[PDB]
């Protein structure tokens, strides 16, 4: 697969596949021609890999998730297959720009944020490690909406990513399956029957997942809803069944109990389990060894229904006795907990479940009885314990606590970061962990070094490989070798030059994409993640305004210049998140157009933050904002991407941030604000934001400017809602960390004035990022939960 | 010569005989893919509906209309 | 007004108006027949529009200018009235070619360049916006001379544009007025009397100004000089008075203190003010509300005399007390500054003014005393400040600084582009702006989308309307909608085809008009504007020679072909401008007839550059040369025409060029060379052209070829004068921007080799041209200076 | 229309380059649509547009049954 044959294949595809020649081909045709050229290189290994799993029958892993935030596929595939340099040359020889062609590809945005990206990063690591693993989700016709900013406000535009075709997916018509809904339960003498149900077909689409340089190509199987089989209206009504896989729910850490969402959850669960059972029965392998052959990871509670579905299949269909089925079920499933925030918790009203999934409601009840019976037997006098451990909540309306169903149906439950897993085990589910201490575990999150270093930052990966070899790609712990260069000035300046070129490249991006002129030598202060009160870009916004006033105060004061970037999407119904976005675009407008500040401070609201755009801004970042309230961010993964790419972190002791300090030395990160214990103490004692506004003169000014219309002259009370929440309903204590935050920020700029020390600290961060590879995360999952090996 | 029509997702229904009577079943002919059609994304066009007529001094304007895009698919003859 | 009635009217006019039939009619008769047919459609609305202003009495605007560069009127009128397609069809049905008939019309070339064209563009916008505005100028019997090239040199031929008759002007005999000259001042007890004066009558000729599709038809009133009332000699001597409106002074940015010019300035001012006063007194409206009913814009200082004339009328005639008259005067006038070049500054010797306008000299003195008294009162110790702010200059001979008279007699003073208005306010008139900061403003120039898009480039206007509707005609900011098609290859190729057809049409022009054979696929590199050392077509000429040598050097080298076009008129007395023209025709002769270059590079000196010819070449242009030295071009408008018509710009950060980069993104224009600050630094440090000639090998060669006769064998030292100025007197630093220029030019050709990227940038220019509509310019003038509304 | 304007063949020769057959009345709307384009968009006078329209279209009748009308 050298340059000459690659150009040949490209021309062949352009002609036969796109039906074009060089005079009529579009940029999109060129992209597709290259995609097909690269895709062909996956076929041999994909067939051999799947064939290998059949022949040698190793225990398989099934990552069941309602989200897979995959981003773009061309570059990733070229890199993991070792074809990037040859393709780059082929395309160049043909007189084209591979970068332009790459930009044509749509992100596969089938996720909202960290949760869906973790799944994507895990598929890449599982393939690089050579595990027999599959990803199972929904092929949404529309992913996370494309975000636009209109009059400073976010606007949602449909993300019609399949319009022009996806060359990376393969319809697998022979594996279509029927999924059942509604109907009614019928208890007969031949077993229980679920009858009079409506059927929706599920057609699976396979996407290859190439491992990094190892001939392994695994599969990501996504299901699409299709109707089975007044006339016109009857045909149009087929849209109703197909609506099940029509669109991704765009909420991050937020439970929206809509009936359609329930259908999606059962849909993916029913199709997936049937497909796994069928594959099991054809393995040439009695369901006795089912769990020795199958491991199914529940990504959050979203696919919780998989537990009573497996039981339904085992009992109602396969005729296994309850006790045996229940045992195999627990040995099969493992559950991962991703959050302790109350609004993200899934609690489905038994009423809704009764109508849609009557047989599953009976199964959940049975599980609950057997569950409570056990608890009643061991702790008789303790009545309230049964109330707290039940899968059923009778608060107002009766509903199912999906998290509790996941705990009892799984043999292992894990958090995503030390601090989070601890809270999950000992605080949130104390009643359960006490009974089964060995069940709860931790599996700190990770990111793949391929997409998040090699792909997104070729300059950095090269510099590192030049100094310590390429072994770090497959074993990131290798980065500690970078320590030897701590006093190496030439290396430190080489490190600083890579970051400098990333900034220039990205600056070109920001100036063509946005009005503003950027100071390429300014410090790039970045906060990109979903807009959330708990993630606090608002606190960040308070600081930007602070820096603003300060310049207006003393114009000629020696101020390290900054280009502040904040980007992220807000869920459509999240009013406060939307208000915060408007607040930020308003502030930027004032700052960027104020003659006294000029090139000193520039603010940008990076719109349509998504995976492919993360790959651009992250490598160009100097300072990474990870400032959620302590105890709110279960883990975080953006924090890791920035650390691996040469940015210093300013943040709280939350999620994985804590472990980043552990690995790199707390001194080499700008930690600040309240800690888990400090937020608790403040809660007990009672929080009154009004007091800090009183004490803090810089804060009072920021606040008065916001509330008085300084940043919304034509709408003086536009941000009234933001002011009220901060003073009387700030569950995330913005004012309480404001002082420590601004103080911390001041120190950052002081260190930035010292290039040699700044870069020395960056080096200590990069050299200490090895722990955060998803290869290490997957290794721990494999040996302590799935019991599988390469 | 060129033929110009509509790419119906569903063509004339498939006919079944049940208890001696005709029954209609949807003709989902594209389900497995049509290798004979070629999407021509570069020639997509907007079609207008509803709205209202506005008679101005620059000519008559058809405004406030709802738009539906039309993506053509070419099949060789 | 459909096709059948239009053909009927045409035949009617051909018969009754031209006294012809189809067998004896000339092409000129056909043109006139059509002109009359179209003219008739203006009458109803013109009478109703002027009648409307009388009835509803809205505040009126009077644009007083010594120049109105109108171009041709037929097409413009047909378009603004929505009759072009019907006429086109009518003429075609009659067996004629409307294009041929249109070519018969003479340009109304009553202007020199940008200044007079801005006035013309403003009349079109003011009518399209429906403002009660009038244009007041001089009906020159001869406009800007017709230029001929003889033996490579410019020759001037009288522009006798009225010889065959102007159907677009209407003599208004009932409004004739007497203008006074010479005589002597007599101070009596009934007031001051200006007696024993010679009288010259002023007969006004009205020309309609149709708004774009809105039933509004405003008026442009031009005054013609007529004598009042040895015998034979006495009658012939009547030519002396009529000589006042005989010919336009053909100088661009150059003050020529000739007595006849002074007479023209007073002539138009006296006639205009009397006419305005008379109309005021008949309005059914006490001069107390004069400025609430009248606004008079001074286009440059040319009509500066209008200030003491209004005072003369108010005081000597209307008997108002000085203080009151002075107040009304300032509230009436507003002054527009068009240049900071020293040779354009009007400084009339008090001696000359004393003899011609003795009463006005007394009035100017009085104004100056009251003015200086105010300054002496506020800044006593500052003596030199009085010297710098006086309307009188006692340097050698005493003279009047007309610009200072305009500032003190106006309530608003404006520049024509951000960078220029800034220099005018804070540098040139710092002494005045400091006292009255609110007086100085900016009003960035503009061009009308009708004549400069719809008329001149029907192909482009149609393509745009096809994609985004026709609303952009009246609101050019609408062009930003063109962004949506940035990745649309079919649209980009459609855009490129329109430009391709413009080039072919214009190529037909160049081959019949000139010897040379043109490469229709070559890049059309164009620089058309008045010949000026400051505009630097000389620098351009240095580059052409550079490209020439390069081809001679490496013949088979891959060179993007170019058709270089440079056109413009030089003022008759401007020796260096004339030398530069000869230098350019000489170079072309060598390049165009050199067998080794052949179809690679062709040079054309487009003769008789004028408005109707601008409408042809501009739409056919790929690369627009806007290369004046930074700080010299106050604004420019040709730069805007090219941007609106699909050409990429290579230029300096000067005049409006700066704002074009702001709107389109600096990256989407080929900016280069020194900036305002860089020219300053070089000035302080001292400029020595000899050093660049030393350092630059390509430059040294160009220069040696010029100075040695390579381009003038029969006259080896013919360009000696050009060589001397460049080495020892180049106030515009040609050699200093030569390197950056040639480098910039190289990049242009590189982008031209990439049709998709070239056209993508063009799109970004066109989509960003909305700001440069004169509709927006007029809106700002109306609400911030004239205080008027549609 | 777009293909016509790119043909390098302003609509005088449109019907010498274009023939559109109306298969039954189903696409009858094509007549006033062409006119709409010619008049409202291309700015041609009604008379000229109407003439080109008739030279462009041809109609095929497929039935005399009342319920198909
Ligand atoms: O879709 C692929 N091939 C196509 C092949 C095809 C194309 C046109 C008609 C029929 C078949 C395919 O299987 N289908 C298109 C149909 C649909 O859209 O439903 C079904 C494909 C090949 C491939 C190879 C790799 Cl390595 C990865 C992904 C891949 N997809
Ligand atoms: C972590 C978090 C996530 C939230 N997500 C959403 C959301 O996705 N959609 C929505 O409408 N509201 C959302 N909210 C707002 C929530 O429903 C409620 O309106 C407010 O917290 C009450 O102040 C969220 C709140 C929090 C704290
Ligand atoms: C911007 C500009 C405009 C000029 N216009 C004229 C002109 O119109 N007629 C003329 O005789 N000289 C003109 N000159 C030349 C000027 O009077 C003087 O001769 C030279 O600049 C001295 O080198 C001009 C020079 C400049 C810089
Ligand atoms: C990694 C990633 C996230 C998660 O970032 P946090 O800062 O951990 O919230 C979200 N969105 C995208 C597009 C990502 O790449
Ligand atoms: C517009 C125009 C000008 C002014 O052009 P610049 O390039 O701005 O100097 C001069 N002459 C004519 C005939 C014009 O159309
Ligand atoms: C419910 C949910 O989306 N939780 C999110 O999960 C990801 C992946 O574990 C964590 O990094 C993150 O902190 C957390 O907010
Ligand atoms: C005195 C004079 O003619 N000035 C000219 O005025 C026009 C109209 O404002 C400007 O565009 C141009 O740059 C400038 O050279």
From Swiss-Prot, chains A, C:
Alphabetized InterPro entries for the sequence: Glycg_phsphrylas (IPR011833), Glyco_trans_35 (IPR000811), Pyridoxal_P_attach_site (IPR035090)
PROSITE patterns, A to Z: PHOSPHORYLASE
SUPFAM superfamilies associated with the record: UDP-Glycosyltransferase/glycogen phosphorylase (SSF53756)
Modified residues (N6-succinyllysine): 324
Known cofactor(s): pyridoxal 5'-phosphate
UniProt-reported outcome of changing residue 430 to Q: Decreased glycogen phosphorylase activity
Site residues, Involved in the association of subunits: 87, 121
Family: Belongs to the glycogen phosphorylase family.
Function of the protein: Allosteric enzyme that catalyzes the rate-limiting step in glycogen catabolism, the phosphorolytic cleavage of glycogen to produce glucose-1-phosphate, and plays a central role in maintaining cellular and organismal glucose homeostasis.
Name used for this protein in its record: Glycogen phosphorylase, liver form
Lineage: Eukaryota, Metazoa, Chordata, Craniata, Vertebrata
Gene name per UniProt: PYGL
UniProtKB/Swiss-Prot annotation, chain D:
Oligomeric and partner information: Homodimer; enzymatically active. Interacts with PPP1R3B; recruits the phosphatase PP1 which dephosphorylates and inactivates PYGL/glycogen phosphorylase.
Lineage: Eukaryota, Metazoa, Chordata, Craniata, Vertebrata
Entry binding sites for AMP: 2
Segments traversing the membrane: none
UniProt disease annotation: Glycogen storage disease 6: A metabolic disorder characterized by mild to moderate hypoglycemia, mild ketosis, growth retardation, and prominent hepatomegaly. Heart and skeletal muscle are not affected.
Modified residues (N6-succinyllysine): 48
Family that this chain belongs to: Belongs to the glycogen phosphorylase family.
Residue numbers of the full-length protein present here: 309 to 385 of 847
Subcellular location as annotated: Cytoplasm, Cytosol
Protein's name in the database: Glycogen phosphorylase, liver form
Role summary: Allosteric enzyme that catalyzes the rate-limiting step in glycogen catabolism, the phosphorolytic cleavage of glycogen to produce glucose-1-phosphate, and plays a central role in maintaining cellular and organismal glucose homeostasis.
Domain of life of the native organism: Eukaryota
């Amino acid at each position: 697969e050298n340059v000459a044959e690659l150009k040949k294949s490209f021309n062949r595809h352009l002609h036969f596949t796109l039906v074009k020649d060089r005079n009529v081909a579009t940029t999109r045709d060129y992209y597709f021609a290259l995609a097909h050229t690269v895709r062909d290189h996956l076929v041999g290994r994909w067939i051999r890999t799947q064939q290998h799993y059949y022949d040698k029958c190793p225990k398989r892993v099934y990552y069941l998730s309602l989200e897979f935030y995959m981003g773009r596929t061309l570059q990733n595939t070229m890199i993991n297959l070792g074809l990037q340099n040859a393709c780059d040359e082929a395309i160049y020889q043909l007189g084209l720009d591979i970068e332009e062609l790459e930009e044509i590809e749509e992100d596969a945005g089938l996720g909202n944020g960290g949760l869906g990206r973790l799944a994507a990063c895990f598929l890449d690591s599982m393939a690089t490690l050579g595990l027999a693993a599959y990803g199972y989700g929904i092929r949404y016709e529309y992913g996370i909406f494309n975000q636009k900013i209109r009059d400073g406000w976010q606007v949602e535009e449909a993300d019609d990513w399949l319009r022009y075709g996806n060359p990376w997916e393969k319809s697998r018509p022979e594996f279509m399956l029927p999924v059942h809904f509604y109907g009614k339960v019928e208890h007969t003498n031949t077993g229980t029957k679920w009858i009079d149900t409506q059927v929706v077909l599920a057609l699976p689409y396979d996407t290859p997942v190439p491992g990094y340089m190892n001939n392994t190509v695994n599969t990501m199987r996504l299901w699409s809803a299709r109707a089975p089989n007044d006339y016109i209206q009857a045909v149009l009504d087929r849209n109703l069944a197909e609506n099940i896989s029509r669109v991704l729910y765009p909420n991050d850490n937020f439970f929206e109990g809509k009936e359609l969402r329930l259908k999606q959850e059962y849909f993916v669960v029913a199709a997936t389990l049937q497909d796994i059972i069928r594959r099991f029965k054809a393995s040439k392998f009695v369901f006795d060894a089912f769990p020795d052959q199958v491991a199914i990871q529940l990504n959050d509670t979203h696919p919780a229904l998989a537990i009573p579905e497996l039981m339904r299949i085992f009992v109602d269909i396969e005729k296994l006795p309850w006790s045996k089925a229940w045992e195999l079920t627990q040995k099969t499933f493992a559950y991962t907990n991703h959050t302790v925030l109350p609004e993200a918790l899934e609690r489905w009203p038994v009423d809704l479940v009764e109508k849609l999934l009557p047989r599953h409601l009976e199964i959940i009840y049975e599980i609950n009885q057997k569950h409570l019976d056990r608890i009643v037997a061991l702790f008789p006098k303790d009545v309230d314990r049964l109330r707290r451990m039940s899968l059923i909540e009778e608060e107002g309306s009766k509903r199912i606590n999906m998290a509790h169903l996941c705990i009892v149906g799984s043999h292992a439950v894990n958090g995503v970061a030390k601090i989070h897993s601890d809270i999950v085990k000992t605080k949130v589910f104390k009643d359960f962990s006490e009974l089964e201490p060995d069940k709860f575990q931790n599996k700190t999150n990770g990111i793949t070094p391929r997409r998040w270093l090699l792909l997104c930052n070729p300059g950095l990966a090269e510099l590192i490989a030049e100094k310590i070899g390429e072994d770090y790609v497959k074993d990131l712990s290798q980065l500690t070798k970078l320590h030897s260069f701590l006093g190496d000035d030439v290396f430190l300046r080489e490190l600083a030059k890579v970051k400098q070129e990333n900034k220039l490249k990205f600056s070109q991006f920001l100036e063509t994409e946005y009005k503003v002129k950027i100071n390429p030598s300014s410090m790039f202060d970045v906060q990109v993640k979903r807009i959330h009160e708990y993630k606090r870009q608002l606190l960040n916004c308070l600081h930007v305004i602070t820096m603003y006033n300060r310049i207006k105060k003393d114009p000629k004061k020696l101020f390290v210049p900054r280009t502040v970037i904040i980007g992220g999407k807000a869920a459509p119904g999240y009013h406060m998140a939307k208000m915060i976005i408007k607040l930020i675009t308003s502030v930027a407008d004032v700052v960027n157009n104020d003659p006294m500040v000029g090139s000193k401070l520039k603010v940008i609201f990076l719109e349509n933050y998504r995976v492919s755009l993360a790959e651009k801004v992250i490598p160009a970042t100097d300072l990474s904002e990870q400032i959620s309230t302590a105890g709110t961010e279960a883990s975080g993964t953006g924090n890791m991407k920035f650390m691996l790419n040469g940015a210093l972190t300013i943040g709280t002791m939350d999620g994985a941030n804590v472990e980043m300090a552990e690995e790199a030395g707390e001194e080499n990160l700008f930690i600040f604000g309240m800690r888990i214990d400090d937020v608790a103490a403040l809660d007990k004692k009672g929080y009154e934001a009004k007091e800090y506004y009183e004490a803090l003169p810089e804060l009072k000014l920021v606040i008065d400017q916001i509330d008085n219309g300084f940043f919304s002259p034509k709408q003086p009370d536009l941000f009234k809602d933001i002011i009220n929440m901060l003073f009387y309903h700030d569950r995330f204590k913005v004012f309480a960390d404001y002082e420590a935050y601004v103080k911390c920020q001041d120190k950052v700029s002081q260190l930035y004035m010292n290039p040699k020390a700044w870069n020395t600290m960056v080096l200590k961060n990069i050299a200490a990022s090895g722990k955060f590879s998803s290869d290490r995360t997957i290794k721990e999952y494999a040996q302590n939960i799935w019991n599988v090996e390469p």
